[PDB]
Amino acid sequence: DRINTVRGPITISEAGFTLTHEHICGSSAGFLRAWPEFFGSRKALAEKAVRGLRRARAAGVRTIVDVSTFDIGRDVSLLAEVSRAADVHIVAATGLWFDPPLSMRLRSVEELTQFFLREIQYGIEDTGIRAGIIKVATTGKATPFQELVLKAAARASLATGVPVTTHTAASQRDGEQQAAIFESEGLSPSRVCIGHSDDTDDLSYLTALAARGYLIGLDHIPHSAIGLEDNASASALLGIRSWQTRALLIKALIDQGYMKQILVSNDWLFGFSSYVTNIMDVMDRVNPDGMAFIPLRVIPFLREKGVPQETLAGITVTNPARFLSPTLRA
Amino acid sequence: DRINTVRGPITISEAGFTLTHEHICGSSAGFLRAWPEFFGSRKALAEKAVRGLRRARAAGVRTIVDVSTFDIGRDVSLLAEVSRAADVHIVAATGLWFDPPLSMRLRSVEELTQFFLREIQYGIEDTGIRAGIIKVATTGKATPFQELVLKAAARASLATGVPVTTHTAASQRDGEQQAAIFESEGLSPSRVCIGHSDDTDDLSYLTALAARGYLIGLDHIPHSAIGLEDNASASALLGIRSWQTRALLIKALIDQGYMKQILVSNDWLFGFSSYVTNIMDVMDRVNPDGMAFIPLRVIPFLREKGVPQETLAGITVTNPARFLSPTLRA
Ligand SMILES: CCOP(=O)(O)OCC
Ligand SMILES: [Co+2]
Ligand SMILES: [Co+2]
Ligand SMILES: [Co+2]
Ligand SMILES: [Co+2]
C-alpha cells in the first residue's frame, strides 16, 4: 500500500503520472563526489535537474523512477535534494547495471541478494533512503555474473514485493532469456518490466512477452540520432529510428490488447559521464523537452493517432502504480 | 618540499621509517559506503586498521603510503580517521589501477591529467586532503587506456613534483615499457617507483632499471601461498615464492650497489573486497604481523645475512623521504 521514494513512503494515489525509467545523473560509483567538475559543478548539475524536473512537473509528471544503480553512480542524497526542490517524487533503485566493479563482480548470488535486500529493507548507504525498484542489465546472452544478478534480483523481489526492471539490447531479444531466468526462480512476470523494448521493430517478440504477463518498457522514445547520423557515438547510443516510430509501438501494443502491460518513459538524464564527454549536450540538442517529452510530445501524438486520453492515462498513471506497489503477484 | 599526508603537509624530518606501498582497504569506488557490512561494519574495519597501524608503529613505522586509487575504493576520510587514531602518517594516492569504471575509461589523456591534478593540487572529493603520490598499473603490455593513464601520470608528476609508483607483472618486465612511456613524456626516473618488482628473479632487469635512476619497489615481501598451495585463489594472488626469496632480492640489489634505488613494503591491507570474500582472513593467516612484517621479520632477516643496520635505515628512512619530497629531479 506504499511506494518507497527518496522522501519516504508515498501512497498509490500520490504517485500520479509516473515516468518509469529515468536518471538524475548517469555516472559511475563514487565519480560524482570525486570529480564533480566533470559536470561543471555539483551545484550546476543539481540546478539543471531542478529546472528539468520543474518543467516535467508543469507538464503533468508527479513521479520519476530513477533506475540508476550503484554502478550508474546513483547518489541518493542528490536525488533527495532535487526531489525536494522540484516537488517531484523520486523512486530510487537497487540492483546492478553493466559496469559493476570487482568488489561486486566477485560476489555470489547469496551476497548480491543480501546487498539488494539491504538497499530495499534497510537503506542506501547511510541515508536511510530505501529503494523501490530493482534494476538489472544484460547486453546479449547473460554472463555468469549477470545470471547471478538476475537471480539475486528475483530473490530480492520475491522477499519484498519490489519489482524488477531491465536493460536489454532488444535487437538481441534479451528479454526472452531474462524471462527464462526470472521464471526459473519462480518470479511472477507481473513484477518484471523488460526495458528498452522500443529498440526493436519486432512486434511479435514484444507481444509474446506481453502475453506471458511481462510489462513492456517503451522507455527510449526520444532517443534518436536522426539529423546527426554522421555522429558515430551518438548514432551508436541512440539509434537511427525516429521518435515517432518508437511511439507507434505504444499504439501497436494497445491495439493488440496489451494496454495494461505498457510502461513508457524518456530514459532521460541531467548529467552523463559514462560515455563521450559532451553526450549530455548532444542529447539535449536532440530533445530540448527532456523528461517533458512524453507528456508534451508523445501523448498528443498518440491522441492524434486516435488513442483515447483515458488509455494514455491508464498507461502513465495506473500501470506504474500497479507495477511499483509491493506485491508478489500483481 | 613538504610531503602531503591525510593530516596535512609534513617535512622530511617528520616522515621517519616509511612503508611505500600499503593499503588501508583494497576495495572499489563507492563500495565501502554502499556495503560497509561486507567488512563487518565500517567501525569494525576502522578498529582493525587502527590496531594494525599501532602494531606497525610499535615496530618502528612512522609513515605509510596508501597507494589505493579512486578505483581501489580509496576513502580518504577513513584514512584520515585511522591516521589520527593510530598516530601514523598516511600519504594518499591519486592515479588509476586495474578497475576504472566507464566514467574513467572513456576519458582522454588531458581529462585524466586534470583529474590527477585535482587530487594533488585541490584535494580529494570535498575533503581538502591532497594526494602525495600517483599510482598507475599495467599487467603485461599496456592497454590503450593504460597508456593514457601512464602519460597523464607523467604529466601530473611533471606539473607538481609528486612521484609516480606502479603495479607491474614483473616476470613480464612491464617496467621496461612503463619506463619507455614515462621517458617519452620526459619524466625523470628519479620520480618513478617500479613496484611489485620482488615478483621477478631477473636481476638483470631490476639493475638495468635501477641504473637508469628508477626506484625499485620490493613491496610484496610477505605475499606467499606456501603452506596453502592448493588454495587456487590465494596461490594466484600471492604466488608461491617464499618471503625469504623476495627478501634476498633486497640483499642482491644492495650487493650490486643499488641501495639508494630500493623501496621496501608489505603491500598489506586491513580490508579487501575486490577478490574472494574472505581473502583478508587468509592473508592474516599467512602474515599475522601485517604491516609490521618488514620491520619485525625482514630487517632482522637481512641483518642476519650481513646487511648493516645503516644500509637498512638508508632504505627504510632516507630513500622514501627523497622519493616523496616533491621535485622534478631527485
Ligand atoms: C588493492 C590490492 O592491490 P594490489 O597491491 O595490486 O594487490 C594486493 C594484494
Ligand atoms: Co539501459
Ligand atoms: Co537508463
Ligand atoms: Co598492485
Ligand atoms: Co597494492
CA separation for the pair A58, A52 (Å, rounded): 10
B308: exposed, middle or buried (Cβ count in 10 Å: 0-12, 13-18, 19+): exposed
Can you say which residues of A are annotated as belonging to the binding site for Zn(2+)? 21, 23, 135, 167, 196, 267
Query: C-alpha grid cell for residue A106?
Result: 566477485
| Best residue in B25, B27, B102 for a mutation probing chain A (most A CBs within 10 Å) | B102
- Within A89-230, strands assigned E span 89-91, 93-95, 133-137, 164-167, 192-194, 215-218
A2: exposed, middle or buried (Cβ count in 10 Å: 0-12, 13-18, 19+): middle
Q: Which residues of chain B lie closer than 8 angstroms to A38, CB-CB?
A: 103
Query: C-alpha grid cell for residue B120?
Result: 594533488
- Within chain A, strands assigned E span 3-5, 8-10, 18-22, 63-66, 89-91, 93-95, 133-137, 164-167, 192-194, 215-218, 262-264
A33·B125 Cβ contact <8 A: yes
A311 near A305, Cβ under 8 Å? no
CA separation for the pair A131, A6 (Å, rounded): 8
Q: Does A75 touch chain B (CB under 8 A)?
A: no
* AA identity, residue A24: I
φ, ψ dihedrals at B226, nearest 5° = -55, 125
Look at residue A261 and give its three-state secondary structure. Answer: helix
A208 near A194, Cβ under 8 Å? no
Query: C-alpha grid cell for residue B103?
Result: 566514467
Q: Does A167 touch chain B (CB under 8 A)?
A: no
A45 near A111, Cβ under 8 Å? no
B130 near B93, Cβ under 8 Å? no
CA separation for the pair A202, A213 (Å, rounded): 18
CA separation for the pair A37, A40 (Å, rounded): 4
CA separation for the pair B157, B192 (Å, rounded): 9
What number of other Cβ atoms are within 10 A of residue A151's Cβ?
21
Taking alpha carbons only, the member of B175, B112, B184, B116 closest to residue B145 is: B112
* AA identity, residue B246: R
B114 near B151, Cβ under 8 Å? no
**Strand pairing report for B262-264 and B215-218:** parallel
Look at residue A102 and give its three-state secondary structure. Answer: helix
* AA identity, residue B185: E
Q: Which residues of chain A lie closer than 8 angstroms to B29, CB-CB?
A: 28-31, 34, 101
Q: Does B154 touch chain A (CB under 8 A)?
A: no
Q: Which residues of chain A lie closer than 8 angstroms to B107, CB-CB?
A: 277
CA separation for the pair B158, B180 (Å, rounded): 16
B152: left (phi over 0), alpha (psi -120 to 50) or beta: alpha
**What's the angle, vertex CA B71, arms to CA B233 and CA B48, rounded to 5?**
65
Query: C-alpha grid cell for residue B239?
Result: 604466488
B295 near B61, Cβ under 8 Å? yes
The best mutation among B269, B275, B280, B287 to test binding of ligand 1, ranked by most ligand atoms within 8 Å of the C-beta, falls on: B269
Experimental method: X-ray
Q: First vs last Cα of chain B: how many Å apart?
A: 11
Residue nearest to atom 4 of ligand 1 (CA): B267
- Within B70-224, strands assigned E span 89-91, 93-95, 133-137, 164-167, 192-194, 215-218
- How far does B273 lie from chain A, in Å, by closest CA? 5
Residue corresponding to grid cell 590465494? B234
CA separation for the pair A20, A31 (Å, rounded): 24
CA separation for the pair B263, B42 (Å, rounded): 31
Catalytic positions of A, written as ranges: 21, 23, 135, 167, 196, 199, 220, 267
* B267 alpha carbon – ligand 1 mean position (Å): 7
CA separation for the pair A288, A127 (Å, rounded): 33
User: What is the domain class of B1-330 according to CATH?
Assistant: alpha beta
CA separation for the pair B35, B37 (Å, rounded): 5
Residue corresponding to grid cell 613538504? B2
3-state helix, strand, coil in chain A (%, to 5): 50, 15, 35
Q: Which residues contact A303 (CB under 8 A, 6 or more apart)?
A: A309, A312
Long-range contacts of B197-204 (CB under 8 A, 24+ apart): B197/B168, B197/B170, B197/B249, B198/B170, B198/B246, B198/B249, B198/B250, B199/B168, B199/B169, B199/B170, B199/B171, B199/B239, B199/B241, B200/B170, B200/B171, B200/B173, B201/B249, B202/B170, B202/B171, B202/B173, B203/B249, B203/B252, B203/B253, B203/B256
Residue nearest to atom 3 of ligand 1 (CA): B26
Query: C-alpha grid cell for residue A322?
Result: 500497479
**Residues at Cβ < 5 Å from ligand 3 ion:** A 267
Distance of CA B283 to the CA centre of its chain: 17
Element spanning B18, H or E: strand B18-22
Query: Which among A28, A107, A125 is the nearest to B101, CB-wise?
Result: A28
What number of other Cβ atoms are within 10 A of residue B229's Cβ?
11
φ, ψ dihedrals at A220, nearest 5° = -115, 25
Q: Does A78 touch chain B (CB under 8 A)?
A: no
Chain A, residues 83-102, CB within 8 A of chain B, namely 99, 101-102
CA distances from A18 to A66, A108, A164 (A): 11, 34, 16
CA separation for the pair A116, B256 (Å, rounded): 55
B124·A34 Cβ contact <8 A: yes
What number of other Cβ atoms are within 10 A of residue B278's Cβ?
12
Q: Which residues contact A256 (CB under 8 A, 6 or more apart)?
A: A203, A207, A210
Cβ < 6 Å from ligand 1: which residues? B 23, 26, 72, 167, 237, 267, 274
B273·A71 Cβ contact <8 A: no
**Which ligand 1 atom sits closest to the C-alpha of B219?**
5
φ, ψ dihedrals at B193, nearest 5° = -110, 120
* AA identity, residue A30: G
* A259 alpha carbon – ligand 5 mean position (Å): 55
**Strand pairing report for B215-218 and B3-5:** unpaired
B293 near B222, Cβ under 8 Å? yes
Instruction: Tell whether the torsion through CA atoms of B115, B121, B124 and B128 is positive or negative.
Output: negative
The CA-based diameter of chain B, rounded to the nearest angstrom, is 51
CA separation for the pair A296, B256 (Å, rounded): 76
A93 near A135, Cβ under 8 Å? yes
CA separation for the pair B26, B46 (Å, rounded): 13
**Three-state SS sequence of B211-254:** HCCCEEEECCCCCCCCCCCCCHHHHHHHCCCCHHHHHHHHHHHH
3-state helix, strand, coil in chain B (%, to 5): 50, 15, 35
* B165 alpha carbon – ligand 4 mean position (Å): 10
Q: Which residues of chain A lie closer than 8 angstroms to B33, CB-CB?
A: 125-126
Q: What's the DSSP call for residue B161?
A: -
CA separation for the pair A198, A220 (Å, rounded): 6
A177: left (phi over 0), alpha (psi -120 to 50) or beta: alpha
* AA identity, residue A58: A
* AA identity, residue A272: F
CA separation for the pair A269, B302 (Å, rounded): 59
Q: First vs last Cα of chain A: how many Å apart?
A: 12
Q: Which residues pair with A26 in a beta bridge?
A: A272
CA distances from A95 to A98, A193, A213 (A): 10, 14, 22
